[PDB]
UniProtKB/Swiss-Prot annotation:
GO terms for cellular component: cytoplasm. This enzyme is the only unique feature of hyperthermophilic bacteria/archaea known and seems to be essential for adaptation to life at high temperatures. It may play a role in stabilization of DNA at high temperatures. Zn(2+) 1 binds at residues 10, 13, 28, 31. It catalyses: ATP + H2O = ADP + phosphate + H(+). This is Reverse gyrase. Residues 714-1100 form the Topo IA-type catalytic domain. It comes from the Bacteria. GO terms for biological process: DNA topological change. Its cofactor is Zn(2+); Mg(2+). The lineage of its organism: Bacteria, Thermotogati, Thermotogota, Thermotogae, Thermotogales. Keywords: ATP-binding, Cytoplasm, DNA-binding, Isomerase, Magnesium, Metal-binding, Nucleotide-binding, Repeat, Topoisomerase, Zinc, Zinc-finger.
Amino acid sequence: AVNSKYHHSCINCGGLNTDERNERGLPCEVCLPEDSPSDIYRALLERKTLKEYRFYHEFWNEYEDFRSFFKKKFGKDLTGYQRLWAKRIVQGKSFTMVAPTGVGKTTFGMMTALWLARKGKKSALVFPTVTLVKQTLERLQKLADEKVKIFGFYSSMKKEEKEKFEKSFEEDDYHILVFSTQFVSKNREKLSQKRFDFVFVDDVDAVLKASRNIDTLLMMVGIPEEIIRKAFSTIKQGKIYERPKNLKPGILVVSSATAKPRGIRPLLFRDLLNFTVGRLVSVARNITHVRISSRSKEKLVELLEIFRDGILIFAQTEEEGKELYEYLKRFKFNVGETWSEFEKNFEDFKVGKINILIGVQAYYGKLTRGVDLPERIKYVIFWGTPSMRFSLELDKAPRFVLARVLKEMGLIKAQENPDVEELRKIAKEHLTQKEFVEKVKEMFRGVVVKDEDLELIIPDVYTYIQASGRSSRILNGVLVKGVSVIFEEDEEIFESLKTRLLLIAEEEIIEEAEANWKELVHEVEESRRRSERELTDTSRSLLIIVESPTKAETLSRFLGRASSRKERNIIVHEAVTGEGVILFTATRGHVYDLVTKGGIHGVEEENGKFVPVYNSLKRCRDCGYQFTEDRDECPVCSSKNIDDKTETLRALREISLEADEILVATDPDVEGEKISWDVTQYLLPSTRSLRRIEMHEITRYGFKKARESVRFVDFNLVKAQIVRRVQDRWIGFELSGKLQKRFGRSNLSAGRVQSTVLGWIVEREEEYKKSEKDFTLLVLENGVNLEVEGKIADDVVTVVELQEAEEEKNPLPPYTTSSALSEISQKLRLGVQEVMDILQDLFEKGFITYHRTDSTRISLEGQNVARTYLRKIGKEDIFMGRSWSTEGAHEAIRPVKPIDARELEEMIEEGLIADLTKKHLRVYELIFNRFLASQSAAVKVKKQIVTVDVDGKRMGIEQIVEILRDGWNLFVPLTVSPRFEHRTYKIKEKKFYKKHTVPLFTQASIVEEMKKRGIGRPSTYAKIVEVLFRRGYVYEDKYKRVRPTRFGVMVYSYLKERYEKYVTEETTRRLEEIMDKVERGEEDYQATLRLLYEEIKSLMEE
Ligand SMILES: [Zn+2]
Ligand SMILES: [Zn+2]
Ligand SMILES: [Zn+2]
């Protein structure tokens, strides 16, 4: 712990508790004075302070009973899925049953109904077919005791049972009633007027077949049609509705929606039961993609001879499908078809009568609405790459083509016009067909331009992912293996497909050389027969907490958002994986912050040591003002519409009860570690299993490598965070007051570093006017311009000495935060803050590595990315992998996937991935090129050193002329220059001036400088500059240089004259150094706090 207080963190009284206690899962000292109590419930009860902890006691107990019961009555222990479901059931919550292929939902429904009836609760079990009713009642009756009233109703019911069921359902206080969906639809009013505690729906689609059934099931727990209609109007509007707080409904549990949840009705579940009926989208895949270079039917024969059984062939059209069908029929392969005898051959393949199924992209994917058995399909063969093809003529041209062409050429800026209208608008301004197709082949990167027959081929990656996916799912708890083979000869098509497959599914496609058919086939078959065996289940449920919604979005993009429980302030998404369930949600910022109320500006002091005091953050959703103090309205605009992180915290504590294991996934810096602790400490009394993962990339790889590096919270980082926060708080408050009493305004000083930097700017203005040395620029004939000492007047430049030399130039190291901010904000007309934001969205959308790094280090994986990209662009002979550094916390800012900017633009305009402005693309382009340059070979250049005489003065100038050998200059342009000859160059024009030796600052220059002096950190740079701007201390001029204003000069003059100690560069650097030492556990937390306090105490007297 870090010895600090959190205002609502008591598990039992709901009030203030210390970090150190929550860490041990204890209630506050008020609730329980004892140091180390033996049993928490017992001790709370003894002292009569037992309040909310009861809830948890009763929870755990009432669960462990269930489990026990389940383990007794049934074979063995609960599976992870059923465990999560159980834990949700004792809370009385309603939900969808998201799970893979038949994990046993009916078993859980049965044992739930049994365990409930054991107390006295009445439940209902609904099934689509009338046979499932029979079977379920069968299985029920033999395991249920005499105390359980069991009835049934279906098609082939009797002549006195049909009425028996009705009278008993009318009066006789039943326990468990098993019936069809038909009965629900038919006897709506009868059920609607009855109240069930548990309702289990096996097939949601059958019951969602009618709109009345929604209101029926809703009225089967005790909800009037008034709330239903009100909620209906609200969902007809387009926003959310809220349930009356005075409602207690039963437990409705349903399975996953097969078809898309079409209609307006299901939204009533979102408001009355707080659960969304989702569909089962599983992205869990174990597929190996191999590519063969030639469409030779001999290769296909050999392959089929290896695979032998359960093969699925896909053809471009039906013509080549039939052709291949005939060729294989002749060669004595047991084969079937989809276009002629669909069902026959399909089910004959399902049984085993057929070894090879040949279909089309259009026939199979639209007629397989029947079954699609996964335990049979091992191999998928693609006879050509699935793709959409367009025509490249003046006519027959789509929208996006003419769009990307004209927008870049001349006609379009950013606009949308009717297609044929656009054709008729370019029908006059274009030149030729040749020039058109050339513009297409030059502009469009990432696709295939068949200029031969005038065609554009775009590989359909989605279709490939689906079709390939048909060979690998989860069966009997086992993620079985599958091989996907592609027969493609055109290198452009294959490369396109591979890039977009890496972009969406992050899956690699290998070559026939690096693939052993025997081994692969073996893995496939063996995993199959491993799934055939009797299952033992080790699936666990997992909760993952991150801080920003964007991370959660892109996480849901590769984990798959099946369903989403809305829990107070937050929206927890759930996904199915091969290792179990996986829940993830976003905090939306920080949770706790330093209080302003008491002590020394929030920091209290007891027993010689300092104790930080935090309270939950509140953000007005209207004006945007943030605060810590507990108020009902916004302290500024007096509005009640606020966001309260305490609600978020409570919600998290609620979710943490379902999950077996929890992982906090905040950014890998001090800030993130602080947040992670604020959360883990709060949750720790509730859940025993809490750990930390640091994701440097937001991709499947970043996540996997994060989980391999799981750990507990590092308290030195928390301590560091705290120390800096306290310095900014104390120094900021004191200096800001001292300025309140001098310049009127209230808030002015955010800290010490800010002031230091401002000093740099202010005094830079003074040492800029003194560097004013007179100069003169000379435009030369048959050459470039030349810069020489002022006041020249001979109009004749002579050449005296002239020599040349070859040199090998290494590239610049990869971007760090300072470097990135500087160069990117310089090359673009953007501020460092804008750049920083773009970087943040870039990392959080899983496109680059962590954007806050002070290391240039690069791993084998990064070098690997560079390597594969160079091998993709052909120039792989210029690859030179460089680690760049061994001393490194994280890597440098680099791309995560070998995809350049142009390809990204292509995928964006196409619609694969979205949400990237032009600026995002440009910044990414800079990062990418810098990284590859850093991974490219050294450029060998020839430069010359020309000594020229100008009016009695010898001046030498060195310039690059020839690039004798390429390297990294392909990504980062290396400027050449016209040669000087040993003659006499005459001056054309003399532009006299006096530009200063020591120039002014720019934002880039400032970041560079404070990096160069040891002031600030990667997370603070841009924020610092922006703050300087927002406080009016500084402005930008014509050529965008940073200049101090009146106010800034006044402020730094005052501060330097009076408080020179707390603004001096030496002091700031010494403090940065010492705190950075605290971060590494080298300097003492409490001691540096003592120091800061001791200088503050001195300041509070001036
Ligand atoms: Zn501790
Ligand atoms: Zn308490
Ligand atoms: Zn407000």
